[PDB]
């Protein structure tokens, strides 16, 4: 199966946050580390995305844009999966060196959001998602958020997204039951991602006030791209309404 071969071959490996675990659970220390981990994972998301089947069919500005818009959901989805598979969703496995318990959930001031993500992670267990389903779904998530006014060359995108949906079908192949649920799980990512976007944006704006450091790419993306989403110029593609 050429398609699954590729996804498996390009899947990023382990990414560490560089968190000081020997040190008090500070709000600023935890979030400075999430922000650094965000940067690290975005580099991996870029190298992954560029390697995906058909990705170069897209106009290079649409290439950049779809990564930037999708980055948060892709991270949310991969993290739920790591959480599921390392700790059976008992805690949130952001990275080997940044595993969130309830206490950290609370101290990060992201408890409500962390609760959503753990519930997503429990879903991977409740539905018996396979590693290959995971991989297909994550690739499709990359093509699941676009400007309401469309992309620069929309037709190439429509075709790519179309082929990623079909590859999800193939792997599924009750089927209709499977596809309903997996498409539902995929839609469930977007409102988490949206709460994460909001939190990240607010934190950026109040970050000098709270001594939270934002790396370069994070400040740029959260100030230039994320407000497109939060202002409604850019929206997720939902399978179900919503």
């Amino acid at each position: 199966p050429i398609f699954l071969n590729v996804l498996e071959a390009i899947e990023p490996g382990v990414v560490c946050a560089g968190h000081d675990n020997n040190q008090p659970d500070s709000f600023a220390a935890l979030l400075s580390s999430l922000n650094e981990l965000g940067e690290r994972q975005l580099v991996h998301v870029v190298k992954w995305a560029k390697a995906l089947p058909g990705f170069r069919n897209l106009h290079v500005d649409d290439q950049m844009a779809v990564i930037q818009y999708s980055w948060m959901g892709l991270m949310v989805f991969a993290m739920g999966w790591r959480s599921f598979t390392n700790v059976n969703s008992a805690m949130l496995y952001f990275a080997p060196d940044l595993v969130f318990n309830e206490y950290r959930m609370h101290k990060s001031r992201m408890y409500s959001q962390c609760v959503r993500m753990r519930h997503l992670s429990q879903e991977f267990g409740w539905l018996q998602i396979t590693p290959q389903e995971f991989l297909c779904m994550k690739a499709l998530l990359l093509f699941s958020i676009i400007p309401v006014d469309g992309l620069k060359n929309q037709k190439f995108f429509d075709e790519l997204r179309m082929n990623y949906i079909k590859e999800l079908d193939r792997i599924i192949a009750s089927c209709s039951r499977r596809f309903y649920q997996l498409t539902k799980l995929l839609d469930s990512v977007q409102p988490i991602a949206r709460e994460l976007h909001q939190f990240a944006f607010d934190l950026l704006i109040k970050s000098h006030m709270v001594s939270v450091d934002f790396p370069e790419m994070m400040a740029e993306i959260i100030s230039v791209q994320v407000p497109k989403i939060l202002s409604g110029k850019v929206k997720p593609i939902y399978f179900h309404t919503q």
Binding site: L42, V43, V46, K50, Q63, M64, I67, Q68, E216, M217, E220, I221, V224
Partner: peptide, 9 residues
């Protein structure tokens, strides 16, 4: 900006 530079590698 920074992202396009990253993307460019």
């Amino acid at each position: 900006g920074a992202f396009q530079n990253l993307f460019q590698s």
